[model samples]
Target: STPAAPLDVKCLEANKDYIIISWKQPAVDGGSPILGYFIDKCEVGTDSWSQCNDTPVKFARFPVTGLIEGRSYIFRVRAVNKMGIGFPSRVSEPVAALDPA
Candidate 1:
């Protein structure tokens, strides 16, 4: 079985080209052990989603770089293990790419 959705999706820090995102682990780990997590991003109000990492991240938080200035985005995380990627968790609130200050 696939894993359940992630919890507490949020971001607190942003630089000109990156955002630090975090989330809690999924409540369920499918029937197998959880391997890692995959993150995806989309510009605010767009359906165009871009994968943030080429590989699953083992950490609960990640810094998404390659972002351009003057734009806002939303992020989501998916749990993946021996089975596969599960459904995406709730998307993060709109976060702009700029200095946190």
Candidate 2:
């Protein structure tokens, strides 16, 4: 069993059209091979969390859609295995991509 490496998450460029999100998948899974990944999201300044698709994401990049213009959103990611999703990575900084009125 090996401890997972530190998590590196980022909220890439954001615009009135879309927001790009990227991350670095953990190399180790504490003795377990990584099976999949789970992503969590929340609106800016809100406690309500919405879980995204929990599928096999070998790479470390996820693009979120269906966003309203000029709204802030927060997201987090984590690794998964047969044991289930592990602790989520640090929450990303709030991201807002709305053109000024």
Top candidate by TM-score:
1
| TM per prediction | 0.94, 0.79
The prediction achieving the highest lDDT against the true structure is 1
Instruction: Give the TM-score (vs. native) of candidate 2.
Output: 0.79
Residue clash pairs of candidate 2: 1-31, 2-31
Q: List the residue pairs that clash in candidate 1.
A: none
Candidate 2 lDDT, 6-74, residue by residue in tens: 276787677766677888877678777887666777888679887766465767777677677877998
**What does the lDDT read for residue 59 in candidate 1?**
87
- Stretches of candidate 1 off by over 4 Å are none
lDDT of 2 at 82: 72
Give the CA lDDT, 0 to 100, for residue 20 in model 2: 74
